């Protein structure tokens, strides 16, 4: 996937958007844009509202001005995005016809949603017990284990959805860069992995501090708190609220506290193992390809739909992979999650990745493993034998907040 990030950064045409005028700059030194067309396009949260095509007449080291037609603008909420692509209409000796040589995208506008949902017809029922809290509404049921504080299971009808409880995740199966030159023999104490290892990240144990159910006028409200600790040190603290409403939608709200003195975590989010296994994945965010925070300029915001298989990157030396950032909506089977997050999804647990030396030895697991991150640390790469993640990409704030909406179709 890195290859794209290169391709885009090294592109020979450069853009600037000023109002509804696009300024094109050519980085060619000798040739004129003579097999180049510019395709443009506007879309609202994945929905296309407009397209153009314009032939480029820019000389090497030159500029070309492009004024766009009056752009539609809807009442509907959502983000409006402009996306442009340069195309090579004719084939060359090293390119096919219709090859895309460059691209760029901008966000044009946002119509924020000032609309409150339709007051639930129904109302969820909470059934208590000493083991757990159950929420029922319709065919749907959710169970939270009062001993662990996690949502242990959920049913749609008679079918269970989880194989594993939904839980907080602060680690990642180490990339090559996280490891560096650290070996079992000769440990590199500076390598991210080592730091994380040493600090207990990988083996910290949760601790129920609190777990309560409350009945709201039109919803149920669960509230929890855990502490992750290692050797009497509290590394992190997770505070959530789940709120299920008549719509049969759960809203998760999470708030982490990270100890100042612990290596910054690779990530901060949740994961769980789904029972289902679907053929496609559809999301509205950056893609289509694997993208990380310090590696996402080549990616575009849009609605992508791909086969599960494509959500895994077969790096010969298995590690965390396949992430997609800036996701606003993700759809898998009957599930739909909404918010602002980064995520990844495959048939391999982090642990399996982390414990397999070669990709050929991985085996697909029972269902689908889903990792949804409110936040993810960068991947680095300046070199692979010392920490290369720039500070801007390290999860060093201390306080982290995020929210989700899980639901069905």
């Amino acid at each position, epitope marked *: 996937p890195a290859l794209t990030e290169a391709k885009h950064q090294q592109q020979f045409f450069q853009f600037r958007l000023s109002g509804q005028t696009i300024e094109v700059t050519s980085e060619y030194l000798f040739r004129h844009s003579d097999n180049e067309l510019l395709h443009w396009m506007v879309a609202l949260d994945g929905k296309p509202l407009a397209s153009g095509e314009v032939p480029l007449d820019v000389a090497p080291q030159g500029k070309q001005l492009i004024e766009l037609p009056e752009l539609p603008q809807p009442e509907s909420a959502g983000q409006l995005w402009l996306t442009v692509r340069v195309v090579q209409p004719n*084939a060359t*000796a090293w390119s*096919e016809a219709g090859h895309i040589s460059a691209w760029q995208q901008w966000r044009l506008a946002e119509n924020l949603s000032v609309t409150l949902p339709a007051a639930s017809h129904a109302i969820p029922h909470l059934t208590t017990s000493e083991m757990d809290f159950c929420i029922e509404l319709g065919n749907k049921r959710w169970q939270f284990n009062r001993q662990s504080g996690f949502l242990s299971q959920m049913w749609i009808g008679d079918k269970k959805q989880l194989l594993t409880p939904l839980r907080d995740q602060f680690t990642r199966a180490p990339l090559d860069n996280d490891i560096g030159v650290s070996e079992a023999t000769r440990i590199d104490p500076n390598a991210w992995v080592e730091r994380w290892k040493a600090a207990g990240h990988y083996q910290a144990e949760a601790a129920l501090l609190q777990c309560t159910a409350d009945t709201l006028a039109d919803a149920v409200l669960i509230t929890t708190a855990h502490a992750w600790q290692h050797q009497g040190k509290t590394l992190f603290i997770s505070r959530k609220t789940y709120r299920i409403d008549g719509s049969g939608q759960m809203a998760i709200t999470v708030d982490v506290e990270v100890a100042s003195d612990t290596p910054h975590p690779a990530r901060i989010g949740l994961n769980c193992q789904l029972a289902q296994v679907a053929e496609r994945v559809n999301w509205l965010g950056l893609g289509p390809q694997e993208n990380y925070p310090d590696r996402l300029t080549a990616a575009c915001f849009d609605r992508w739909d791909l086969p599960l298989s494509d959500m895994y990157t*077969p790096y010969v030396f298995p590690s965390e992979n396949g992430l997609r950032c800036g996701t606003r909506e993700l759809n898998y089977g009957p599930h739909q999650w909404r918010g602002d997050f980064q995520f990844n999804i495959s048939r391999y647990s982090q642990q399996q990745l982390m414990e397999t030396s070669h990709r050929h030895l991985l085996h697909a697991e029972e269902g689908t493993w889903l990792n949804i991150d409110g936040f993810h640390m960068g991947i680095g790469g300046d070199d692979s034998w010392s920490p290369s993640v720039s500070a801007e990409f390290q999860l060093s704030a201390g306080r982290y907040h995020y929210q989700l909406v899980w639901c069905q179709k």
Partner: antibody
Amino acid sequence: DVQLQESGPSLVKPSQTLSLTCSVTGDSITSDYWSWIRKFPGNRLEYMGYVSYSGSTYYNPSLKSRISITRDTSKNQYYLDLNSVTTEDTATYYCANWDGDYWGQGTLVTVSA
Amino acid sequence: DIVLTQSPATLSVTPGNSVSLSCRASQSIGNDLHWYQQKSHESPRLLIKYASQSISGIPSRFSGSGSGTDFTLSINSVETEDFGMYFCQQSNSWPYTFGGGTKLEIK
């Protein structure tokens, strides 16, 4: 030295899946790229596809996603699966390495009701 | 996709004489053009690769030439064992494609 040989049904029914095996002897299947080529009754040759060392596959668009090429290192064989065949798929099928130096003897497969 | 056109479709020659077969691509394919011989009830046999590169085990009388869109396979002093079909194939772009073939027969 290397030897390739096709095996599998010579007669199949319309709509079924045509499956052929190419047995490689003399060297490992992990030591080359493997292909499938077929010749239609009218002397027309078509390159169906190939699988390279990483496992990446390349299929002829003419096959409209009906083709799958897989490998089995333990048996030192690779395969061709062509789904929903029609009379248009009647042809002589050959397996050969990507370089084109090694070819199987070819096997005629007739698709008839 | 790249279309390869071969001419003539059929060529008759008397053993001892020389012939040249043509293969033209719909678009430039550099030097990625290979030549195959095929006889009835037999698998294709690679004669020349990458337009003009020789193949071990092939008679010296076979030679190839060309680049871009126009290629030629020449047979210096045809032998009876040379009668059969000749196909060109390009590997410059996927999908690889074959020409329609030229039949070489005894005159």
